[model samples]
Target chain A: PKYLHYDEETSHQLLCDKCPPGTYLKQHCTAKWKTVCAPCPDHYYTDSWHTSDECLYCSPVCKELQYVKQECNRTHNRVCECKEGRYLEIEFCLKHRSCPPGFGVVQAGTPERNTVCKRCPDGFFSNETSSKAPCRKHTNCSVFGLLLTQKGNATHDNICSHHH
Target chain B: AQPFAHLTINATDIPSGSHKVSLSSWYHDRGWAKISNMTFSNGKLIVNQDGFYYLYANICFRHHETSGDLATEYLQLMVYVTKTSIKIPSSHTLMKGGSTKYWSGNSEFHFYSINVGGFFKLRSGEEISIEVSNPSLLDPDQDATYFGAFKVRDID
Candidate 1:
């Protein structure tokens, strides 16, 4: 909707067009002239319609462990984010913690949060620390025509003795 | 006279490999970076004076998934500052630390930044270098990764 703005120089209330996003006001409206605007130069942005004369400079380049999520444009500043498998630690990025042996990933790591791990339940075993490996069911020696030599623990696989 | 230097990573010529990578390159003469009364070459910072100095190192690790998903493995991103001198023919670790994480290796990017620093008495002609556990996973941004030292005072 067109709104009325008082022009202090003209000493009258006049309806004028406000500069749109990505643009800056070059000239204000007068009795006979309409508002004039200019596009923001490179690496600058104006996110809202206003009568301001200048646009804001874009944000600085991405820092270490950071990637450009969104490039700078006329209307918006660039956005930076940590790469995959990493999360924000203070202002810096940090890799997600890997589950230790005997634990399995309950939830995968994301850019915003660290990995979630749970201890292996009964009948399951995780022999090594890993990022993606899930717990495995304990070996059934009878099914494999072998004798159970040792029961498996959360951090080790079951041992079986085969017979000819 | 006190001697000091600051070095950043120069990734243009880093070797490309998958595992057991170590830092072997650096840049010492660039914007706001400097080296005076010291020598830097092939990732080693050569000391020129006998004094107590404050040394520091920062490393940023990053990897992007390309092509397709591969095997996911646990990764340890580590950084170490070592000193080698004629007195101790073998290289001695001054400071060492890092982050351990598991990467999904899916179509995503992962990042981690680690830093280690301390005050130590150094000898003349001693060589110092920064070693990383995984060079292929390093972020090439100069501001994010660097190593340097400042002279505090002369030894008694």
Candidate 2:
């Protein structure tokens, strides 16, 4: 008696039948077959099999007084924005606005969305008459000479005693 | 012979451990000697021969839990020799301390000189030991002491 024989054609047909939903058959033949399958690329989606191409990027959203500084990447997905106290000249935003000589940025922001400058903290003072200079603390006298009296902020109080 | 060689134990590196005070050759010359640990009855030591010898002792101090409280301590340095019985003079007290005039742990090193070659001479087959104690008011056991000895050799 003669037995039936299964060929390459039969094997490929079996594989195609079992192919998952997200996967696709790139090529198929009686001898061999190939399948191509991958997750959706950035800023794109493939709801079903055999997707044509990736989707376009969505417009970037920004918070109050902030705007997108840079557009999203063509392939990858990213968006840069200028925060408050900052302004956009061309495509980029200049957020680092200069403070007055004596004034300092207790909280800093860009020119477009700047917060009010404030005086230096206790134990520190701005030497500059204008708002341009950053605030600085009193000279660290302890390093040059021993500390005698306790003054200024508690954190800066390092007193030293004389050796008998 | 010189009356006493001036010996000074400076507090330069006074730490919590055994320290060498001074070494004098008036005791022994150049030979090994062994002595069982014992306290000296008299404050003096006499050597009759010459051989190599070593002296050792310890200084100890304790800290107080109370902040800013001045801690008190004491010092003890024993003398060891080859062939003699060490004598601690009756004038020397085992303990000494006062409140206002507490022993100072300052960097100022104290100097003590003793006459050698007189009553004490390093002789062969001779062994001696001397104990010097310092008592403290704040802490009775707190002592900052040092131990030292000298080697001596005699030629006929």
Candidate 3:
């Protein structure tokens, strides 16, 4: 028998041993016949042992907005990630990278890491949450009849005193 | 390349009112934990592949639900697919087992069920989800509620 399984108490009704990873259950055993097994078909896998009839499929070819984070194997499924300049929300990877209104890029994305954003310095602003400030120069308060009251950070622009 | 081909979601109740249904949750007791790659957030189904899928939902309500149209009781179930490519939503009526008269309000009536199930051709990036009318009145019990959809096969 091909790895056939049975219980001595209920000998008349036979069962097959569980299939191992990388293979699928091809047939159930009868009292006289043994169970059958087959290798997981191409592009499919069995991550764990089971007596089930189907194999897991590799993820669909990476989408245009996605990249292969981990390739599929005979015992594991493929893992995917959003391409550069994107963020994960609701399992739906969405495009989100933007130059903040005041911060600098302290970290670029890596295969295993997420992008880290920094805040802006005084006297300048990325304004919004971009929270992509290029760290531009501050405005001249005196020439504009205003007083430089607060310096800018990676997140906001320098504040000037109210002028008459 | 369909991964979640056998989708089955048990129905549950939320604050009754019109709103989208949420299929998965991080809370251990409220979600489909066995499915792969595919993910759900809020009330949206984030599909990972382009394929044909079968969709279905069943809801059973009990107790006396006081309504504006108390004398004319009505229940509806719908499947909505949002096509990201065109930014439009397509809705298919999945369940309306029969006439509205038999199930409409009678106050005397205590048990009711609204159930629908079917399949569709979907694409990558599109979102598929569900909701109901005055969802606030739905039955949230384990045995009388359910909703689910799963991929069937790849599309051309």
- Alpha carbon lDDT of each predicted model: 0.78, 0.35, 0.54
Error of 1 at B42 (Å): 4.5
Instruction: By TM-score, rank the candidates, best first.
Output: 1, 3, 2
For candidate 3, the C-alpha RMSD (Å) to the true structure equals 19.3
Model 2 regions more than 4 Å off: A1-75, A78-97, A108-116, A129-133, A142-164, B1-156
Q: Which model, 1 or 3, shows the larger DockQ?
A: 1
* A48-124: candidate 3 lDDT, tens digit per residue: 77787878766443433467878988788788777665654432344455555445555654433445666545555
Of candidate 2 chain B, the 10-residue stretch with the lowest lDDT total is B25-34
User: Worst lDDT window (10 residues) for model 1 chain B?
Assistant: B64-73
- Decide which is better by TM-score, 2 or 3: 3
Q: Would you give me the overall lDDT of model 3?
A: 0.54
Q: Compose the digit string of candidate 1's lDDT tens values, residues B1-156.
A: 678888878777666555545566886866435788888865579888889999999898876554454355588778889998757778889998897888775545577899889999988879898777778767776777789999999898
Candidate 2's TM-score reads 0.22
Chain A TM-score for each candidate, in the given order? Answer: 0.58, 0.34, 0.46
lDDT by residue (A42-90, candidate 2, tens digit) is: 3333223332333333233333334555544433334445555455443
Interface RMSD of 3: 16.9
